[PDB]
Amino acid sequence: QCVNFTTRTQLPPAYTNSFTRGVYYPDKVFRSSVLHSTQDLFLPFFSNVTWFHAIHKRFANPVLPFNDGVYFASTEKSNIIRGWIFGTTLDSKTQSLLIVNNATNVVIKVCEFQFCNDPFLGVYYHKNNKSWMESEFRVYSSANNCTFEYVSQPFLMDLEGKQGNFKNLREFVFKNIDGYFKIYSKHTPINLVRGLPQGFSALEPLVDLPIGINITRFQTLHISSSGWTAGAAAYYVGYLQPRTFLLKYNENGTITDAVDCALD
Amino acid sequence: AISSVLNDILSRLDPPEAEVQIDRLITGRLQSLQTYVTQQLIRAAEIRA
Amino acid sequence: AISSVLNDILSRLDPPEAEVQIDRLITGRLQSLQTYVTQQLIRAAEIRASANLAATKMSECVLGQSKRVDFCGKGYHLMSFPQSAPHGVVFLHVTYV
Amino acid sequence: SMTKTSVDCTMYICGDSTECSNLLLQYGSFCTQLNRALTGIAVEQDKNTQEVFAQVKQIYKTPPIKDFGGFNFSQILPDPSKPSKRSFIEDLLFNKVTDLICAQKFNGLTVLPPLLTDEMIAQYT
Amino acid sequence: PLSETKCTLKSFTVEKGIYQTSNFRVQPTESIVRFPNITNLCPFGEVFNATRFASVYAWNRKRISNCVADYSVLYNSASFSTFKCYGVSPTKLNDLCFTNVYADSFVIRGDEVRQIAPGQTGNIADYNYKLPDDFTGCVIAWNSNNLDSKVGGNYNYLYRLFRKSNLKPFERDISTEIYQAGSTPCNGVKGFNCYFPLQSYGFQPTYGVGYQPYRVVVLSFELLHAPATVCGPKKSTNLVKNKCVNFNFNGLTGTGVLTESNKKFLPFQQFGRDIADTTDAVRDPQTLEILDITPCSFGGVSVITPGTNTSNQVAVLYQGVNCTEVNVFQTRAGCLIGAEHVNNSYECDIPIGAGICASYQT
């Protein structure tokens, strides 16, 4: 709880490039064989995002500020990352947003929590009926004054442990528009060791969270209490900026190409 | 505007209030006259051709 | 104005207040419509100038034989073969060089 | 010729509105001037096809026995085997020059069809 | 139809030729609204039974989605002190489609009642909480001056009068501490021509309306692309395609002809648009269906008649529209009423279109 992990340490702020990352569906509009240009909070092409990783003797969970919006890049194997914790002071002084990933839906709880210095969720007793289910709460000691609660739509996830290079990839975007929280999700398998591969994918709408809380900083929920360790995963953090993209819509209503006109 | 006749506007509204309705008549007649002149320049190119 | 849809204006401002915002839409859309008509009339002079030139080439180059230089095309003209084309016409000229 | 367009002043500016239709009556004859202007264009665009495409009112046909002195006119002459009457050169002319017509009619912009069709223009040629 | 040309040409003599008079348009004969079954009902009457309402910044809210506000229990008819409404009433909210509905409960004064407007400014708007641009509902108020108000002012409830900046729609600040009041930051503790941001009610039962407490209930609405599952207690009205109707689909109200489309929409995409950024096709929220949105057919009306000194026979021409009402013939130009179809070819007298010409003969 209040005591961090024995393997927790601060990694140097290395940087890596995101080829096409930052592209998402701006709205629910369907279009076919047309070129539409929109402007919103985006991640510019060929940018630089922080290079972080967490393993079972190196664990890094820094607190990063949230201003113009944040981009999430999660490279996973057994899907260690269960979400992110949001809020202003990240304590009981104000509201705090959390994301709980059970590999079924996405649980969003906005309440007043007592913040532990190293948030964690106990996963124990793998001898019989593993199920990879979350049980104990090391994140918050107490809970009250809940102004918001939400449950997402069901999806599919594989929590089985694997070896070798990275496999699963989950790219999220979190932004604040007039108090409405629009989270956009994409999940695709990739072949990656370190850094980021060169590829193109579009992020589909995930959940709409009309909450309205102010968030000045965010921390990450990596989970898999000094005796508890973490799993093998890597995570990157981007920043949204007001850039104009030219999106190519195909006959199926998906983005097959993207062009950042503020770059070159 | 209230009336197309300027005398009806000058004899009714106050000088500060009349400036609102007079500007509507002038700007409208400027567009009506500019449209006429623009159409005459087009017919001028047709008759010179 | 507040919005381009008249239903959004009538559902918010009062009838006396809504007439002011609607007049902003009418004046702008009319000026936008007058601009379109003005551009079409200006482009109408070019399409008629090309039509009178095409009718002149159709008469002199196709029907007869024009001795005009650089009219029926480079070289001494012989015969012209017209061909139908979308929103226009294509002339195939036989020249002597 | 160019695409024939006809625009209604009321439907383009504000449609399905009775109160806005009364505000158009205060601005005068702008409907009459803009409608007759575009209508005058559609007429002149049709006169361009009559003064160019069809020079004479007598139709001439190609004789079945062809001795041209060595020339092959099958390229410039139309092909009767096609469902539409066009030549081998007009094959590329019509194909290389590019619904959007119905899309303009959805917003209140009427597109008038031409008087001389593709078959009638090809016959004059 | 001959006299319609006379009023168009401003003359009592109509020369031989084709003349345009009016513009034909098909009016919608039905209102088609199709949405799935009922899930839940919004707390319209559940928040009216509370003991008391919190302050302006403390407002309680309960989120019940699926539009479709509870129409069974309605206290909105002459049950309270005064009713100032905008848009449509809760009785009329059944004909509109909303995503999320927040039932808000707060207590304000008399001067702050008129300040409540959708997405507008005010003392409680840009400082405590601002209502979103999507609010079509009624502002319901009741007179608490004989209950909540006390002699010498009521300091129990609180509100923040000053803030460093104006709030955006759906934005809140609950901080009661000392912050920037005006445009010049005073750096914390009150002074330097700033004021204490938090304020209290001065409610006096003996003064006028402005100092009287009023309990106000506001229903927050969402007009965004998220579909609503229910419209009204009477929903369907039976969709029949190939007809001009007034439709409301997935929150988009329009008038046009409904046709079936084969387009495949993304499960996260409710409706499409064309190159002109206008409604193209929509998806059925009830079952799986793709409806192509086309506007109702319309066109110009041309009067084909010979000279006034020749004959009074008139041929009505409909340009680019099929005549479903109705010598009714159809050509590539459109429905032609009043003329006969001759298979023989003649010299063109009165041009129509697509190579069709009209003439007056035996």
CSV table of N, CA and C in Angstrom, one decimal, chain E residues 199-333:
chain,number,residue,atom,x,y,z
E,199,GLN,N,-20.0,33.1,-1.5
E,199,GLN,CA,-21.0,33.9,-0.9
E,199,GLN,C,-22.2,33.1,-0.4
E,200,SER,N,-23.0,33.8,0.4
E,200,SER,CA,-24.1,33.2,1.1
E,200,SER,C,-25.4,33.9,0.7
E,201,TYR,N,-26.6,33.2,0.9
E,201,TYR,CA,-27.9,33.8,0.5
E,201,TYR,C,-28.3,34.8,1.5
E,202,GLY,N,-28.9,35.9,1.0
E,202,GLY,CA,-29.4,36.9,1.9
E,202,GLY,C,-30.9,36.9,2.0
E,203,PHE,N,-31.5,35.7,1.8
E,203,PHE,CA,-32.9,35.6,1.7
E,203,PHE,C,-33.7,36.2,2.8
E,204,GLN,N,-34.6,37.2,2.5
E,204,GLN,CA,-35.4,37.8,3.5
E,204,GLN,C,-36.9,37.6,3.1
E,205,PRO,N,-37.7,36.9,3.9
E,205,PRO,CA,-39.1,36.6,3.5
E,205,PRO,C,-39.9,37.9,3.3
E,206,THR,N,-39.4,39.0,3.7
E,206,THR,CA,-40.2,40.3,3.6
E,206,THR,C,-39.9,41.1,2.4
E,207,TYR,N,-38.9,40.7,1.6
E,207,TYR,CA,-38.5,41.5,0.4
E,207,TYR,C,-39.2,40.9,-0.8
E,208,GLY,N,-38.8,41.4,-2.0
E,208,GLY,CA,-39.4,41.0,-3.3
E,208,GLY,C,-38.9,39.7,-3.8
E,209,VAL,N,-39.2,39.5,-5.1
E,209,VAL,CA,-39.0,38.2,-5.7
E,209,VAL,C,-37.5,37.8,-5.7
E,210,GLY,N,-36.6,38.8,-6.0
E,210,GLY,CA,-35.2,38.5,-6.2
E,210,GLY,C,-34.5,37.9,-5.0
E,211,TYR,N,-35.0,38.2,-3.7
E,211,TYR,CA,-34.5,37.6,-2.5
E,211,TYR,C,-35.2,36.4,-2.1
E,212,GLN,N,-36.2,35.9,-2.8
E,212,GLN,CA,-37.0,34.7,-2.5
E,212,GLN,C,-36.3,33.4,-2.9
E,213,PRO,N,-36.1,32.4,-2.1
E,213,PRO,CA,-35.6,31.1,-2.5
E,213,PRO,C,-36.5,30.4,-3.4
E,214,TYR,N,-36.0,29.8,-4.5
E,214,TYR,CA,-36.7,29.0,-5.4
E,214,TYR,C,-35.9,27.7,-5.7
E,215,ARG,N,-36.6,26.6,-5.4
E,215,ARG,CA,-36.0,25.3,-5.7
E,215,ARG,C,-36.2,25.0,-7.2
E,216,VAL,N,-35.1,24.8,-7.9
E,216,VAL,CA,-35.1,24.6,-9.4
E,216,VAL,C,-34.7,23.2,-9.8
E,217,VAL,N,-35.4,22.6,-10.7
E,217,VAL,CA,-35.0,21.3,-11.2
E,217,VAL,C,-34.8,21.4,-12.7
E,218,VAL,N,-33.6,21.1,-13.1
E,218,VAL,CA,-33.2,21.2,-14.5
E,218,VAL,C,-32.7,19.8,-15.0
E,219,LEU,N,-33.2,19.4,-16.2
E,219,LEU,CA,-32.9,18.1,-16.8
E,219,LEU,C,-31.9,18.3,-17.9
E,220,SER,N,-30.7,17.9,-17.6
E,220,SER,CA,-29.6,18.0,-18.6
E,220,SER,C,-29.8,17.0,-19.7
E,221,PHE,N,-29.5,17.4,-21.0
E,221,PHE,CA,-29.8,16.6,-22.2
E,221,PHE,C,-28.5,16.4,-22.9
E,222,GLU,N,-28.5,15.4,-23.8
E,222,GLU,CA,-27.4,15.1,-24.7
E,222,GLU,C,-27.9,14.9,-26.1
E,223,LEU,N,-27.5,15.7,-27.0
E,223,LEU,CA,-27.9,15.7,-28.4
E,223,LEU,C,-26.9,15.0,-29.3
E,224,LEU,N,-25.8,14.4,-28.7
E,224,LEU,CA,-24.7,13.8,-29.4
E,224,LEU,C,-25.1,12.6,-30.2
E,225,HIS,N,-24.2,12.0,-31.0
E,225,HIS,CA,-24.4,11.0,-31.9
E,225,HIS,C,-24.8,9.7,-31.3
E,226,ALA,N,-24.7,9.5,-30.0
E,226,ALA,CA,-25.2,8.3,-29.3
E,226,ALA,C,-26.7,8.1,-29.5
E,227,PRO,N,-27.1,7.0,-29.9
E,227,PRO,CA,-28.6,6.8,-30.3
E,227,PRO,C,-29.4,6.7,-29.0
E,228,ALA,N,-30.7,7.2,-29.2
E,228,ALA,CA,-31.7,7.0,-28.2
E,228,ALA,C,-32.6,5.8,-28.5
E,229,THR,N,-33.0,5.0,-27.5
E,229,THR,CA,-33.7,3.7,-27.8
E,229,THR,C,-35.2,3.9,-27.8
E,230,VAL,N,-35.8,5.0,-27.4
E,230,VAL,CA,-37.2,5.1,-27.3
E,230,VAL,C,-37.6,6.6,-27.7
E,231,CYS,N,-38.7,6.7,-28.5
E,231,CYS,CA,-39.3,8.0,-28.7
E,231,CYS,C,-40.8,7.8,-28.5
E,232,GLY,N,-41.3,8.5,-27.4
E,232,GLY,CA,-42.7,8.5,-27.1
E,232,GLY,C,-43.3,7.2,-26.6
E,233,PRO,N,-44.5,7.3,-26.0
E,233,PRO,CA,-45.3,6.1,-25.7
E,233,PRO,C,-45.8,5.4,-27.0
E,234,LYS,N,-46.1,6.2,-28.0
E,234,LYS,CA,-46.5,5.6,-29.3
E,234,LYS,C,-45.3,5.8,-30.2
E,235,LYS,N,-44.7,4.7,-30.6
E,235,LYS,CA,-43.4,4.8,-31.3
E,235,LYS,C,-43.5,4.7,-32.8
E,236,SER,N,-43.8,3.5,-33.3
E,236,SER,CA,-43.6,3.0,-34.6
E,236,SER,C,-44.2,3.9,-35.7
E,237,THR,N,-45.5,3.9,-35.7
E,237,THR,CA,-46.4,4.5,-36.7
E,237,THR,C,-46.2,3.8,-38.1
E,238,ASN,N,-45.6,2.6,-38.0
E,238,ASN,CA,-45.3,1.7,-39.2
E,238,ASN,C,-44.5,2.3,-40.3
E,239,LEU,N,-43.2,1.9,-40.4
E,239,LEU,CA,-42.4,2.5,-41.5
E,239,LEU,C,-42.8,1.9,-42.8
E,240,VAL,N,-43.1,2.7,-43.8
E,240,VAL,CA,-43.4,2.3,-45.2
E,240,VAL,C,-42.5,3.1,-46.1
E,241,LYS,N,-41.6,2.4,-46.8
E,241,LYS,CA,-40.6,3.0,-47.7
E,241,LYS,C,-41.2,3.6,-48.9
E,242,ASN,N,-40.4,4.2,-49.8
E,242,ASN,CA,-40.8,4.7,-51.1
E,242,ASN,C,-41.9,5.8,-50.9
E,243,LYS,N,-41.9,6.5,-49.8
E,243,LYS,CA,-42.9,7.5,-49.6
E,243,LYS,C,-42.3,8.7,-48.9
E,244,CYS,N,-42.8,9.9,-49.1
E,244,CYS,CA,-42.4,11.1,-48.5
E,244,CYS,C,-42.9,11.2,-47.1
E,245,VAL,N,-42.0,11.2,-46.1
E,245,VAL,CA,-42.4,11.2,-44.7
E,245,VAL,C,-41.5,12.1,-43.9
E,246,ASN,N,-41.9,12.5,-42.7
E,246,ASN,CA,-41.1,13.2,-41.7
E,246,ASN,C,-40.5,12.2,-40.8
E,247,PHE,N,-39.2,12.0,-40.8
E,247,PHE,CA,-38.5,10.9,-40.0
E,247,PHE,C,-37.6,11.5,-38.9
E,248,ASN,N,-37.5,10.8,-37.8
E,248,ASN,CA,-36.5,11.1,-36.8
E,248,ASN,C,-35.8,9.8,-36.5
E,249,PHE,N,-34.5,9.7,-36.9
E,249,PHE,CA,-33.8,8.5,-36.7
E,249,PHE,C,-32.5,8.7,-36.0
E,250,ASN,N,-32.3,8.0,-34.9
E,250,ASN,CA,-31.1,8.1,-34.1
E,250,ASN,C,-30.8,9.6,-33.6
E,251,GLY,N,-31.9,10.3,-33.4
E,251,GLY,CA,-31.8,11.7,-33.0
E,251,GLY,C,-31.7,12.7,-34.1
E,252,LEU,N,-31.8,12.3,-35.3
E,252,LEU,CA,-31.7,13.2,-36.5
E,252,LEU,C,-33.1,13.3,-37.1
E,253,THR,N,-33.6,14.5,-37.0
E,253,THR,CA,-35.0,14.8,-37.5
E,253,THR,C,-34.9,15.4,-38.9
E,254,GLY,N,-35.6,14.8,-39.8
E,254,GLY,CA,-35.6,15.3,-41.2
E,254,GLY,C,-36.8,14.8,-42.0
E,255,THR,N,-37.0,15.4,-43.2
E,255,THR,CA,-38.1,15.0,-44.0
E,255,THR,C,-37.5,14.6,-45.4
E,256,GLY,N,-37.9,13.4,-45.8
E,256,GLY,CA,-37.4,12.8,-47.0
E,256,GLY,C,-38.0,11.5,-47.3
E,257,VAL,N,-37.6,10.9,-48.4
E,257,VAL,CA,-38.0,9.5,-48.8
E,257,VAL,C,-37.1,8.5,-48.2
E,258,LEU,N,-37.7,7.4,-47.7
E,258,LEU,CA,-36.9,6.4,-47.0
E,258,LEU,C,-36.8,5.2,-48.0
E,259,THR,N,-35.5,4.8,-48.2
E,259,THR,CA,-35.2,3.6,-49.1
E,259,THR,C,-34.2,2.7,-48.4
E,260,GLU,N,-34.3,1.4,-48.7
E,260,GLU,CA,-33.3,0.5,-48.2
E,260,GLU,C,-32.0,0.6,-48.9
E,261,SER,N,-30.9,0.6,-48.0
E,261,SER,CA,-29.5,0.7,-48.5
E,261,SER,C,-28.7,-0.6,-48.2
E,262,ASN,N,-27.8,-0.9,-49.0
E,262,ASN,CA,-26.9,-2.1,-48.8
E,262,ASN,C,-25.6,-1.7,-48.2
E,263,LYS,N,-25.4,-0.4,-47.8
E,263,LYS,CA,-24.2,0.0,-47.2
E,263,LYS,C,-23.9,-0.7,-45.9
E,264,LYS,N,-22.7,-1.0,-45.6
E,264,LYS,CA,-22.3,-1.7,-44.3
E,264,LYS,C,-21.7,-0.6,-43.4
E,265,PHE,N,-22.4,-0.3,-42.3
E,265,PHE,CA,-22.0,0.7,-41.3
E,265,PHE,C,-21.1,0.0,-40.3
E,266,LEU,N,-20.1,0.7,-39.8
E,266,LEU,CA,-19.4,0.2,-38.6
E,266,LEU,C,-20.3,0.1,-37.4
E,267,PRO,N,-20.2,-0.9,-36.6
E,267,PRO,CA,-21.1,-1.0,-35.4
E,267,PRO,C,-21.0,0.2,-34.5
E,268,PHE,N,-19.9,0.9,-34.6
E,268,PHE,CA,-19.8,2.2,-33.8
E,268,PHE,C,-20.2,3.4,-34.5
E,269,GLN,N,-20.7,3.3,-35.8
E,269,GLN,CA,-21.1,4.4,-36.6
E,269,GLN,C,-22.6,4.3,-36.8
E,270,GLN,N,-23.3,5.4,-36.3
E,270,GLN,CA,-24.8,5.4,-36.4
E,270,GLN,C,-25.3,5.8,-37.7
E,271,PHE,N,-24.7,6.8,-38.4
E,271,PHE,CA,-25.3,7.4,-39.6
E,271,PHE,C,-24.1,7.9,-40.5
E,272,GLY,N,-24.4,8.0,-41.8
E,272,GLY,CA,-23.4,8.5,-42.7
E,272,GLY,C,-23.8,9.8,-43.3
E,273,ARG,N,-22.8,10.4,-44.0
E,273,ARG,CA,-23.0,11.7,-44.7
E,273,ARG,C,-22.4,11.6,-46.1
E,274,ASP,N,-22.8,12.5,-47.0
E,274,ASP,CA,-22.3,12.5,-48.3
E,274,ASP,C,-21.1,13.5,-48.5
E,275,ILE,N,-20.7,13.8,-49.7
E,275,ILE,CA,-19.6,14.7,-49.9
E,275,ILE,C,-20.0,16.1,-49.5
E,276,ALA,N,-21.3,16.4,-49.5
E,276,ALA,CA,-21.7,17.8,-49.1
E,276,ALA,C,-21.9,17.9,-47.6
E,277,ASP,N,-21.6,16.9,-46.8
E,277,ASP,CA,-21.7,16.9,-45.3
E,277,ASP,C,-23.2,17.0,-45.0
E,278,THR,N,-24.1,16.4,-45.7
E,278,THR,CA,-25.5,16.3,-45.5
E,278,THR,C,-25.9,14.8,-45.3
E,279,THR,N,-27.0,14.6,-44.6
E,279,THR,CA,-27.4,13.2,-44.2
E,279,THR,C,-27.6,12.4,-45.5
E,280,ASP,N,-26.9,11.2,-45.5
E,280,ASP,CA,-26.9,10.3,-46.6
E,280,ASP,C,-27.7,9.0,-46.3
E,281,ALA,N,-27.3,8.2,-45.3
E,281,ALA,CA,-27.9,7.0,-44.9
E,281,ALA,C,-27.8,6.9,-43.4
E,282,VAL,N,-28.8,6.2,-42.8
E,282,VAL,CA,-28.9,6.0,-41.4
E,282,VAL,C,-29.1,4.5,-41.1
E,283,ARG,N,-28.9,4.1,-39.9
E,283,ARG,CA,-29.0,2.7,-39.5
E,283,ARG,C,-30.2,2.6,-38.5
E,284,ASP,N,-30.9,1.5,-38.6
E,284,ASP,CA,-32.1,1.3,-37.7
E,284,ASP,C,-31.6,1.0,-36.3
E,285,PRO,N,-32.0,1.8,-35.3
E,285,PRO,CA,-31.6,1.5,-33.9
E,285,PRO,C,-32.4,0.2,-33.3
E,286,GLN,N,-33.6,-0.1,-33.9
E,286,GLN,CA,-34.3,-1.2,-33.3
E,286,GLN,C,-33.8,-2.5,-33.8
E,287,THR,N,-33.8,-2.8,-35.0
E,287,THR,CA,-33.3,-4.0,-35.6
E,287,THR,C,-32.1,-3.6,-36.6
E,288,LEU,N,-31.6,-4.6,-37.3
E,288,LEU,CA,-30.4,-4.4,-38.1
E,288,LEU,C,-31.0,-4.0,-39.5
E,289,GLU,N,-30.9,-2.8,-39.9
E,289,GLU,CA,-31.4,-2.3,-41.2
E,289,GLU,C,-30.6,-1.1,-41.6
E,290,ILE,N,-30.4,-0.9,-42.9
E,290,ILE,CA,-29.7,0.3,-43.4
E,290,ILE,C,-30.6,1.1,-44.3
E,291,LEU,N,-31.0,2.3,-43.9
E,291,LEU,CA,-32.0,3.1,-44.6
E,291,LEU,C,-31.2,4.2,-45.3
E,292,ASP,N,-31.4,4.3,-46.6
E,292,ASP,CA,-30.8,5.4,-47.4
E,292,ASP,C,-31.7,6.6,-47.3
E,293,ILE,N,-31.2,7.8,-46.8
E,293,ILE,CA,-31.9,9.0,-46.7
E,293,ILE,C,-31.9,9.8,-48.0
E,294,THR,N,-33.0,10.0,-48.6
E,294,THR,CA,-33.2,10.8,-49.8
E,294,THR,C,-34.3,11.8,-49.6
E,295,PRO,N,-34.1,13.0,-50.0
E,295,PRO,CA,-35.2,14.0,-49.8
E,295,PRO,C,-36.4,13.8,-50.7
E,296,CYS,N,-37.5,14.3,-50.4
E,296,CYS,CA,-38.7,14.1,-51.2
E,296,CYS,C,-38.5,14.8,-52.6
E,297,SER,N,-39.1,14.1,-53.6
E,297,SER,CA,-38.9,14.5,-55.0
E,297,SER,C,-39.6,15.9,-55.2
E,298,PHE,N,-38.9,16.7,-56.0
E,298,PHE,CA,-39.5,18.0,-56.3
E,298,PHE,C,-38.9,18.5,-57.6
E,299,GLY,N,-39.6,19.4,-58.3
E,299,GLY,CA,-39.1,20.0,-59.5
E,299,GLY,C,-40.0,21.1,-60.0
E,300,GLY,N,-39.6,21.7,-61.1
E,300,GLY,CA,-40.3,22.9,-61.6
E,300,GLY,C,-41.5,22.5,-62.4
E,301,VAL,N,-42.4,23.4,-62.6
E,301,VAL,CA,-43.7,23.2,-63.3
E,301,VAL,C,-43.6,24.1,-64.6
E,302,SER,N,-43.5,23.5,-65.7
E,302,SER,CA,-43.5,24.2,-67.0
E,302,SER,C,-44.8,24.1,-67.7
E,303,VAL,N,-45.3,25.2,-68.2
E,303,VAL,CA,-46.6,25.3,-68.9
E,303,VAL,C,-46.3,25.3,-70.4
E,304,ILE,N,-46.7,24.3,-71.2
E,304,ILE,CA,-46.6,24.2,-72.6
E,304,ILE,C,-47.9,24.5,-73.2
E,305,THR,N,-48.0,25.7,-73.9
E,305,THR,CA,-49.3,26.1,-74.5
E,305,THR,C,-49.0,26.8,-75.8
E,306,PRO,N,-49.8,26.8,-76.8
E,306,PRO,CA,-49.6,27.6,-78.0
E,306,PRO,C,-50.0,29.0,-77.8
E,307,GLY,N,-50.0,29.8,-78.8
E,307,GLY,CA,-50.3,31.2,-78.7
E,307,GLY,C,-51.7,31.4,-78.2
E,308,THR,N,-52.0,32.6,-77.6
E,308,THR,CA,-53.3,32.9,-77.1
E,308,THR,C,-54.3,33.0,-78.3
E,309,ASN,N,-53.9,33.5,-79.4
E,309,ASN,CA,-54.8,33.6,-80.6
E,309,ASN,C,-54.9,32.2,-81.4
E,310,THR,N,-54.2,31.2,-80.9
E,310,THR,CA,-54.3,29.9,-81.6
E,310,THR,C,-55.2,29.0,-80.8
E,311,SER,N,-54.9,28.5,-79.6
E,311,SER,CA,-55.7,27.7,-78.8
E,311,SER,C,-55.4,27.8,-77.4
E,312,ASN,N,-56.4,27.4,-76.5
E,312,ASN,CA,-56.2,27.5,-75.1
E,312,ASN,C,-55.7,26.2,-74.5
E,313,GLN,N,-55.4,25.2,-75.3
E,313,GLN,CA,-54.9,23.9,-74.8
E,313,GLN,C,-53.6,24.1,-74.0
E,314,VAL,N,-53.5,23.4,-72.9
E,314,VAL,CA,-52.3,23.5,-72.0
E,314,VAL,C,-51.8,22.2,-71.7
E,315,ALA,N,-50.4,22.1,-71.8
E,315,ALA,CA,-49.7,20.8,-71.4
E,315,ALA,C,-48.8,21.1,-70.2
E,316,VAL,N,-49.2,20.5,-69.1
E,316,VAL,CA,-48.4,20.7,-67.8
E,316,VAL,C,-47.2,19.8,-67.8
E,317,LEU,N,-46.0,20.3,-67.5
E,317,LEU,CA,-44.8,19.6,-67.5
E,317,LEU,C,-44.2,19.6,-66.1
E,318,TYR,N,-43.8,18.4,-65.6
E,318,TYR,CA,-43.2,18.3,-64.3
E,318,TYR,C,-41.7,17.9,-64.6
E,319,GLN,N,-40.8,18.7,-64.2
E,319,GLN,CA,-39.4,18.5,-64.5
E,319,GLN,C,-38.7,17.6,-63.5
E,320,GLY,N,-38.2,16.4,-63.9
E,320,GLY,CA,-37.4,15.6,-63.0
E,320,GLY,C,-38.1,15.1,-61.8
E,321,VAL,N,-39.4,14.8,-61.9
E,321,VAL,CA,-40.1,14.3,-60.8
E,321,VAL,C,-41.2,13.4,-61.4
E,322,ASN,N,-41.5,12.3,-60.6
E,322,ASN,CA,-42.6,11.4,-61.0
E,322,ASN,C,-43.9,11.8,-60.4
E,323,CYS,N,-45.0,11.8,-61.1
E,323,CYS,CA,-46.3,12.2,-60.7
E,323,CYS,C,-47.1,11.0,-60.1
E,324,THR,N,-47.2,11.0,-58.8
E,324,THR,CA,-48.0,10.0,-58.1
E,324,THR,C,-49.4,10.4,-57.8
E,325,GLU,N,-49.8,11.6,-58.1
E,325,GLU,CA,-51.1,12.1,-57.7
E,325,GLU,C,-52.1,11.8,-58.9
E,326,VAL,N,-51.9,12.6,-60.0
E,326,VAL,CA,-52.7,12.5,-61.2
E,326,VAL,C,-54.2,12.2,-61.0
E,327,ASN,N,-54.3,11.5,-70.0
E,327,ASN,CA,-53.2,11.9,-70.7
E,327,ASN,C,-52.0,12.2,-69.8
E,328,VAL,N,-51.6,11.2,-69.1
E,328,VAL,CA,-50.4,11.3,-68.2
E,328,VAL,C,-49.3,10.3,-68.7
E,329,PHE,N,-48.3,10.9,-69.2
E,329,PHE,CA,-47.2,10.2,-69.8
E,329,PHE,C,-45.9,10.6,-69.1
E,330,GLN,N,-44.9,9.7,-69.2
E,330,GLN,CA,-43.6,9.9,-68.5
E,330,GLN,C,-42.5,9.8,-69.6
E,331,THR,N,-41.6,10.8,-69.6
E,331,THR,CA,-40.4,10.9,-70.4
E,331,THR,C,-39.2,11.0,-69.6
E,332,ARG,N,-38.0,11.2,-70.3
E,332,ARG,CA,-36.8,11.3,-69.5
E,332,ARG,C,-36.7,12.7,-68.8
E,333,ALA,N,-37.5,13.7,-69.3
E,333,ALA,CA,-37.6,15.0,-68.6
E,333,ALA,C,-38.4,14.9,-67.4
